[PDB]
Design a binder for this molecule. Structure first.
Ligand SMILES: CC(C)(COP(=O)(O)OP(=O)(O)OC[C@H]1O[C@@H](n2cnc3c(N)ncnc32)[C@H](O)[C@@H]1OP(=O)(O)O)[C@@H](O)C(=O)NCCC(=O)NCCS
Lengths: 383, 383
């Protein structure tokens, strides 16, 4: 084998997360949003938006789009005026810059040298460019120019699971390989003024926030330097039955526009157990309540119905609900925060593993397709 | 290992290509192009465009944008009027449709069942959508809903090499895995009226054409059932020094806008030997003239200077020049055609291998970065 393969399973070797500094309280967002878009007279619409915010499960979100930025780019504050170029001017720098913030933290925890990074896997939903955010991230961090890159533009909310799936095969098939798995999201491509005829707009405006997470992934950890946090044992995905059209997203002259023509929480709840039953098997099929649950917090409804359908104890979804609460829906980056939050809860409560006492757990994303992405991890001991 | 790995190197097991039916002869293209965009008064510009066409090394190209289609979508015939929406209406269907035509041919040559495809790796430069072209192709072909997908939107011309690099790790790390490696391009997202303000555009308008290629990639071929055409032994890439901005692409309200710098052939030719010297080593560093050369035909100047710098014999670049001649630059798909052409030339001339008698060869792409992508292949014997 002309490029020698690695021996052990892929491991998460370090985690880093990052958010823009400005915070937006959900209890105050309807006034700010409808004012900055000059729609404050639309009382009935604002009341509807408030209902959505009140049901969202979100306390605050981080966003680069401050009052100053929005006043400086009025095109983004319209409903459908052509604005894609001013949108890309914001996200082309912020998306890799935020990723670099998170990547420095992940490398610090890992303990290795930046010059030993061999691969980058990068997901986003926030605009596109040539060369891509992967290339920018390599420059910002001063990586070696021979770094091997996989740039997954335009994924939607399953992309965090995607980067860990791809990193697994890259780390497992290349002796010595150390991968940066990256997901970074900035809401400037999707932001727009509220409208009575765009209800999916209303929901996105209540849910989406900014953030980035990156993991260092690698097989065969050097014992004198590297400490694995999680092992990756299985990765797969499926398209759910009769889900055509559930989530559509079109990049247009006015930015990214979503249309949701099916019951997404219902589609996932009705189908998740059959597929999760398959993922369990290669690790001996533990019971749902013997596992940890790093679930993408697309919204409170999806977390609730999965909790009920599987009869999970209330602590299982707490990691996900914490992230929803403090950061909202950061699209592909969210699930990376969730796993991190489960690790932190484990340390704070003195559990025996970094999966809150459980040995195996799920790392789950979903999005357009309707696509369900699932990985199975093993948690390290908490020493 | 909870998902068992494969044993042998990844193999190309079948090849398929496809193009839209309409043909555009290069010697007449300046008349048609300047006609249909109502630019016939720009005589000086048209003379320059003809000079480019005559030096391009291109005899004809295939394009979906026929006279009737262009007349029916007048926004695409403008310089900068907003047109991204009707452009995406074309490429969101045509890009996967073209891929499906090439994939059927590749699957027929492979001989396996479509239900045994496990993976899709998909590159393109022709717009974006959610769900992606990968999902559309899975639907059109009737693949399993559990197919694992990697969608590299917005790669530029190195993406053909990219999909094979990714396919290598996916096939080598998964026992029984059979991957569809796909690259598909349609020029409707980049086409626009010629202008004295966008001379880079003139070169793009002379070079780019439509096409798609797909390879079946897999390790461990079942003897007497599957016949490998090439083995993949090495894959790497590098960013060339001081080449920021050589190739740029931004997706805007008016479609995709490229920047192409006069230095590109020089940047590649002045650096390629140094890197290829390294890629050679894991297979024993064969001599340049003992290898075959599947090189992305970005332009005639690039092929010419690489041939000179490396002192290659005149037959080494013929495969690339054939593809340039008959199809032009089909961005990420082009190099997939080149390898297929080298196999056909081998058979036609009765060579001893499918690499025109050589044992090892390069599969080379380049694009925004400036990124150089290289794989090292071994050719099968010619029985
Ligand atoms: C385009 C190409 C065929 C030009 O042919 P050539 O043999 O170099 O001949 P010339 O230098 O006379 O070029 C012809 C004309 O194109 C112009 N031209 C070439 N490259 C240009 C560029 N990047 N931008 C603008 N004009 C360009 C020249 O200035 C010249 O104009 P002129 O007739 O008014 O002097 C050749 O330079 C080439 O293959 N370039 C690389 C293409 C490329 O970058 N690949 C696409 C993406 S990888």
């Amino acid at each position: 084998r002309a490029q020698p393969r690695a021996e052990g399973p892929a491991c998460v070797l370090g985690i880093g997360t990052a958010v823009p500094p400005a915070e937006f309280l959900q209890s105050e967002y309807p006034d700010f949003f409808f004012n900055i878009t000059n729609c404050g007279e639309k009382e009935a619409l604002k009341a509807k938006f408030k209902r959505i915010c009140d049901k969202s499960g979100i306390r605050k979100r981080h966003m680069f789009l401050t009052e100053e930025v929005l006043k400086a780019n009025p095109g983004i504050c319209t409903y459908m005026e052509p604005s894609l170029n001013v949108r890309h001017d914001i996200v082309v720098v912020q998306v890799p810059k935020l990723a670099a913030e998170a990547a420095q933290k992940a490398i610090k925890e890992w303990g290795g040298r930046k010059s030993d990074i061999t691969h980058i896997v990068f997901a986003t939903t926030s605009g596109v460019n040539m060369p891509g955010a992967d290339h920018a991230l390599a420059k910002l961090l001063g990586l070696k120019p021979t770094v091997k890159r996989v740039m997954m533009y335009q994924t939607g909310c399953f992309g965090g699971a995607s980067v860990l799936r791809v990193a697994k095969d890259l780390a497992e098939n290349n002796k010595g390989a150390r991968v940066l798995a990256v997901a970074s999201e900035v809401t400037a491509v999707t932001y727009r003024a509220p409208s009575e005829n765009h209800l999916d707009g209303l929901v996105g405006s209540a849910l989406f926030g900014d953030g980035a997470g990156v993991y260092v992934v690698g097989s065969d950890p050097k014992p004198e330097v590297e400490k694995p946090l999680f092992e990756v044992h299985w990765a797969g995905e499926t398209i759910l039955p009769e889900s055509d059209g559930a989530i559509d997203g079109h990049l247009t002259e006015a930015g990214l526009i979503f249309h949701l023509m099916k019951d997404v929480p219902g589609l996932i709840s009705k189908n998740i157990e059959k597929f999760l039953n398959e993922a369990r098997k290669p690790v001996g099929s533990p019971a749902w309540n013997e596992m940890f649950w790093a679930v993408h917090p697309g919204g409170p409804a999806i977390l609730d119905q999965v909790e009920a359908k599987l009869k999970l104890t209330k602590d299982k979804m707490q990691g996900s609900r914490d992230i929803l609460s403090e950061f909202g829906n950061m699209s592909s980056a969210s699930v990376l925060f969730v796993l991190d939050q489960i690790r932190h809860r484990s340390v704070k409560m003195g559990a025996s593993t970094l999966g809150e006492g459980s040995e195996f757990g799920f790392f789950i994303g979903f999005g357009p397709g309707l696509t369900l992405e699932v990985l199975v991890l093993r948690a390290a001991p908490n020493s």
